[PDB]
Amino acid sequence: EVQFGAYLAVLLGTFLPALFLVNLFIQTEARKAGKAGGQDSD
Amino acid sequence: MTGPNPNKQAVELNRTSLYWGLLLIFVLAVLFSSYFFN
């Protein structure tokens, strides 16, 4: 018998902070593509 | 409203520091899962 609140602990302990760190990378590359002025800035 | 804030900055995270922070979360997820499931 395992604790059924541990699935919510682990799978949100993975996904919520890991999806956070993806966002800081995507907006980093968007600012670099934003300044660069070619074909992707818009 | 009032005027635009001159303290606007930008946030950066290079591709290097992405893989640190991903691996940091998964290894803490590997380590602490066994205790949480008990």
């Binding site: 699935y7 | 290079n14 591709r15 893989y19 691996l23 998964f26 290894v27 590997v30």
Partner: peptide, 30 residues
């Protein structure tokens, strides 16, 4: 049902090891 989470954490860890080696930001002089 319980061990399915442990396997997903292990092979998910080996994914980001794969992307860090081959899709690394290649450092360049100048």
């Amino acid at each position: 049902m319980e061990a399915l989470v442990y396997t997903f954490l292990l092979i998910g860890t080996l994914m980001v090891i794969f992307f860090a080696v081959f899709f690394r930001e290649t450092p360049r002089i100048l």
